């Protein structure tokens, strides 16, 4: 009996972690987005899939204390349109804008994760 499959059940995550679904058994191809508790920051993979060998990649962790990352980086052919505060914070996104000659490819905003900002929008001439 049983196919070649090997389906998933929610593994032992962090006590302060909370999965998006939060179901007991995950079907192969379920993406278990994780997050941490209200006052916790999730660090690591915030989305793992249920594969036919198990939930992968391995689970992220929870940090209450993160960095504020200071001000955001510059944009290559734009700038930050928002008020650059000396202290942003985790999950604080920064709306950028590129010049009126470019198309903005990636996310115009980026949020700082742990203490590192995510991948910039990047714009190209239209």
UniProtKB/Swiss-Prot annotation:
Give the source lineage, highest ranks first.
Eukaryota, Metazoa, Chordata, Craniata, Vertebrata
Modified how: Sulfated on tyrosine residues.
| UniProt tissue specificity | Expressed in the retinal pigment epithelium (at protein level). CFH is one of the most abundant complement components in blood where the liver is the major source of CFH protein in vivo. in addition, CFH is secreted by additional cell types including monocytes, fibroblasts, or endothelial cells.
Name-wise, this protein is Complement factor H
Instruction: Describe which stretch of the whole protein the shown chain covers, with first residue, last residue and complete length.
Output: 566 to 687 of 1231
Outline the extent of the Sushi domain: 6-64, 67-125
Altering residue 112 to S: what's the impact?
A: In CFHD; with membranoproliferative glomerulonephritis
Provide the function of this protein.
Glycoprotein that plays an essential role in maintaining a well-balanced immune response by modulating complement activation. Acts as a soluble inhibitor of complement, where its binding to self markers such as glycan structures prevents complement activation and amplification on cell surfaces. Accelerates the decay of the complement alternative pathway (AP) C3 convertase C3bBb, thus preventing local formation of more C3b, the central player of the complement amplification loop. As a cofactor of the serine protease factor I, CFH also regulates proteolytic degradation of already-deposited C3b. (Microbial infection) In the mosquito midgut, binds to the surface of parasite P.falciparum gametocytes and protects the parasite from alternative complement pathway-mediated elimination.
The effect of residue 6 to G is:
Associated with basal laminar drusen
Name the linked condition.
Basal laminar drusen: Drusen are extracellular deposits that accumulate below the retinal pigment epithelium on Bruch membrane. Basal laminar drusen refers to an early adult-onset drusen phenotype that shows a pattern of uniform small, slightly raised yellow subretinal nodules randomly scattered in the macula. In later stages, these drusen often become more numerous, with clustered groups of drusen scattered throughout the retina. In time these small basal laminar drusen may expand and ultimately lead to a serous pigment epithelial detachment of the macula that may result in vision loss. Complement factor H deficiency: A disorder that can manifest as several different phenotypes, including asymptomatic, recurrent bacterial infections, and renal failure. Laboratory features usually include decreased serum levels of factor H, complement component C3, and a decrease in other terminal complement components, indicating activation of the alternative complement pathway. It is associated with a number of renal diseases with variable clinical presentation and progression, including membranoproliferative glomerulonephritis and atypical hemolytic uremic syndrome.
Q: Fill in the domain comment.
A: Sushi 1-3 domain represents the minimal unit capable of cofactor activity. The property to discriminate self surfaces from non-self surfaces depends on the C-terminal region made of Sushis 19-20.
Subunit structure and binding partners: Homodimer. Also forms homooligomers. Interacts with complement protein C3b; this interaction inhibits complement activation. Interacts with complement protein C3d. Interacts with CR3/ITGAM; this interaction mediates adhesion of neutrophils to pathogens leading to pathogen clearance. Interacts with complement factor I.
Q: Where are the disulfide bridges?
A: 8-50, 36-62, 69-112, 98-123
Enumerate the subcellular locations listed in this protein's record, separating them with semicolons: Secreted
């Amino acid at each position: 009996e049983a196919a070649g499959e090997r389906e998933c059940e929610l593994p032992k995550i962090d006590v302060h972690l909370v999965p998006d679904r939060k179901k007991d058994q995950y079907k192969v191809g379920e993406v278990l987005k994780f997050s941490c508790k209200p006052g916790f920051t999730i660090v690591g993979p915030n989305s793992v899939q249920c594969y036919h060998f198990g939930l992968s990649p391995d689970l992220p962790i929870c940090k209450e204390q993160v960095q504020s990352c200071g001000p955001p980086p510059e944009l290559l052919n734009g700038n930050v349109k928002e008020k650059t505060k000396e202290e942003y914070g985790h999950s604080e996104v920064v709306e950028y804008y590129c010049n009126p000659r470019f198309l903005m490819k990636g996310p115009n905003k980026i949020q700082c994760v742990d203490g590192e900002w995510t991948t910039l929008p990047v714009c190209i001439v239209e």
